[PDB]
Amino acid sequence: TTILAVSYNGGVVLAADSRTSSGTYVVNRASNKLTKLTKKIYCCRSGSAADTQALAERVSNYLGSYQTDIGAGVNVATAANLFQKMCYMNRWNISAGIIVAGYDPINGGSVYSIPSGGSCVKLDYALGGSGSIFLYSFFDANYKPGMSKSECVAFCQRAVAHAYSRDGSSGGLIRTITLDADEPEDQTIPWNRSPYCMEKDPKYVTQATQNQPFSSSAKITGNRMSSTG
Amino acid sequence: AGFDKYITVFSPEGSLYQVEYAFKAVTYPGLLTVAIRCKDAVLVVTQHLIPDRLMRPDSVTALYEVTPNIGCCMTGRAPDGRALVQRAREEASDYQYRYGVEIPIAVLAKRMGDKAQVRTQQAGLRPMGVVSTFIGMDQSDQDGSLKPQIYTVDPAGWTGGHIACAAGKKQVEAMAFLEKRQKSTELDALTQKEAAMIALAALQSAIGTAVKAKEVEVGRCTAANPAFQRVPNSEVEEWLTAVAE
Numbered sequence: 001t002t003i004l005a006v007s008y009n010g011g012v013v014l015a016a017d018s019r020t021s022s023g024t025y026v027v028n029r030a031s032n033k034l035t036k037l038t039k040k041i042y043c044c045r046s047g048s049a050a051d052t053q054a055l056a057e058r059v060s061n062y063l064g065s066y067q068t069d070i071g072a073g074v075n076v077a078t079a080a081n082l083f084q085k086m087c088y089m090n091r092w093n094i095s096a097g098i099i100v101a102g103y104d105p106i107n108g109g110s111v112y113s114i115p116s117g118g119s120c121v122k123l124d125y126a127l128g129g130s131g132s133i134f135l136y137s138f139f140d141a142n143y144k145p146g147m148s149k150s151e152c153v154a155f156c157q158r159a160v161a162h163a164y165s166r167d168g169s170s171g172g173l174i175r176t177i178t179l180d181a182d183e184p185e186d187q188t189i190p191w192n193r194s195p196y197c198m199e200k201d202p203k204y205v206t207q208a209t210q211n212q213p214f215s216s217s218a219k220i221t222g223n224r225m226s227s228t229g
Numbered sequence: 230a231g232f233d234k235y236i237t238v239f240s241p242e243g244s245l246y247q248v249e250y251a252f253k254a255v256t257y258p259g260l261l262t263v264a265i266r267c268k269d270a271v272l273v274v275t276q277h278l279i280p281d282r283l284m285r286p287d288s289v290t291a292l293y294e295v296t297p298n299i300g301c302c303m304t305g306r307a308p309d310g311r312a313l314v315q316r317a318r319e320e321a322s323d324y325q326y327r328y329g330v331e332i333p334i335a336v337l338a339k340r341m342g343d344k345a346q347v348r349t350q351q352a353g354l355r356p357m358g359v360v361s362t363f364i365g366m367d368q369s370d371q372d373g374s375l376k377p378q379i380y381t382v383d384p385a386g387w388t389g390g391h392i393a394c395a396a397g398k399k400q401v402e403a404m405a406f407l408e409k410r411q412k413s414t415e416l417d418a419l420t421q422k423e424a425a426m427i428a429l430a431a432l433q434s435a436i437g438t439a440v441k442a443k444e445v446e447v448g449r450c451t452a453a454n455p456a457f458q459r460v461p462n463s464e465v466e467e468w469l470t471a472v473a474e
Contacts, residue, residue, distance in 0.1 A: 057326070065322045068294050 002131030002163040002170040003033055003044035005101035006143075007124050008152040011109035011180025012101040014042050015156035017131065017164050018173035018188075020049055029172040034186075038063050040179050041079050041102030046129035047116070051094040055086055076102040076110035080120050088118035097128045103179045131167035135159055153178060157189060161196040236352045247356065248349050251384035254358025255305035261397035262291070262304050263407070263432050264362050264379045267424035268417060270451040271364045271377035272460075273302045274428050276397070276436075277446040292448045292459060296321050298365055299334050300448045300457030304396040305359030305384075313357050317341055334365040338380035338388045346386030356384045360396040364448065366455045375452045392416050395431065403435035421451070425468045433472070442466045 002017040020028035035043050035056040041063075045052035059082045063074050080100045087096060098114040113126040124145055127135050138159055147155060157174050164170035174194060177186045191197070198204050213224040233239075234246035262275040275291045293301045293314045301317060303310025320340050324332040341361060348354040361382040366375040379391040393416055395403035410416075410427055419427070425447070433439055447460040 061322060061326045064325070065318060068296070068318055071294070 001046045001129035003128045005099045005111045005126050007109045011103040013152045015160045015176045017170040019171045044099035046097040048095040052096045075104040080112035084120035091118040099126045131163035131170035134163050134166045158195040161194045248385045251356040251358040255360050256398045259398045263395045263428045265393045265424045265428040266377035267419045270421045273448045298455045302362040303359050309357040310359035334378045341382045342386040342388035399435045403431045406431040406434045426472045
């Protein structure tokens with residue numbers, strides 16, 4: 001699982017892979033890990049699918065009633081607090097890493113990370129899942145804060161592609177959603193149109209020289225790909 | 230055997246006095262509401278009069294949102310209805326968390342009537358002296374289209390749909406006007422403008438004062454926009470001018 005959220009000037013972009021895997025078999029290759037909480041607030045879920053689904057459904061139910069009670073919109077901080085409380089009271093029984101990202105008219109675009117421990121950190125960008133470990137040095141080198149909306153979406157897709165190119169537990173479709181003062185816009189790009197994969201990378205085209213032909217010299221001359229040669 | 234009217238026990242005539250008295254608490258405040266449904270929308274108009282000029286007019290209202298797609302109007306003891314609104318909202322939320330779909334308006338009205346009936350059989354509980362009017366859109370089967378729906382809940386727990394209804398002070402005159410207008414036209418085939426004009430005409434004829442726009446508040450659900458929302462004062466003004474012909 002690879003999930004991330006990046007804030008730009010207007011709002012936020014949430015990106016995720018689509019792969020639910022039972023260890024080494026792909027149970028689902030078209031999952032949707034970007035779960036709607038309110039109209040402008042979403043969460044990226046990593047870990048136990050049942051636990052994260054139940055947590056998201058409960059938080060969405062709580063937030064929907066709260067809008068009717070107060071008669072106004074909900075800030076991203078409220079949803080972040082709801083997840084933080086619900087994950088902290090159940091931290092020993094659930095396996096969940098949550099990213100709460102959204103737009104509210106008061107604080108603009110917000111991104112919150114709630115790891116397995118149950119804390120809540122407000123960040124410019126957040127990463128999560130097994131494939132997030134591959135992206136940290138990718139963000140330290142290639143990520144510049146202050147990108148435009150389209151630039152942020154493209155960077156998020158490229159980061160997700162780079163993450164699941166190396167992570168066996170991640171892969172499949174790349175799903176992104178943009179949340180800002182305008183209408184939220186989703187996008188799903190397939191693997192065959194992904195911004196990066198090692199199969200299309202020209203520097204991994206040449207195979208490692210492992211199957212030496214039987215030769216009278218120590219000179220390495222490529223792999224043996226024929227019986228005669 | 231002497232009182233028989235201070236608690237929910239049967240009278241010798243087989244009637245509940247504490248529930249009949251709660252019906253008089255509906256018309257006690259002197260307010261009136263009229264709900265109508267056209268071919269593609271449902272409207273509710275409630276008297277919103279503020280004699281105290283020091284009172285913030287937009288703070289007090291009788292129109293409530295139960296769910297984004299279900300709106301409510303309360304007529305009677307103002308706090309009491311508020312309480313019921315809370316219950317209704319809870320009855321929605323739990324339902325949403327139990328079945329994953331939004332509660333139907335008829336189901337919500339039936340459950341609210343069930344809640345009212347309990348207070349008419351338990352001794353210590355006082356009935357809510359309000360009449361609840363839920364308006365919304367219903368998702369039909371075999372065609373997928375939406376239809377306007379009005380459902381009223383009485384303090385006795387009686388739940389019923391309506392093509393058009395009135396509740397409050399001088400509700401009988403409003404109902405008579407609506408029935409007289411129904412003998413000529415067909416309400417379920419009219420448009421939103423005609424239905425709004427009919428509802429405002431009935432409200433005016435019941436009270437005979439030629440209400441302005443600031444004196445009423447209107448809630449609306451439409452087939453194009455299923456969400457419940459309040460009509461802006463400009464549209465109410467143009468409706469009233471159309472009625473004034």
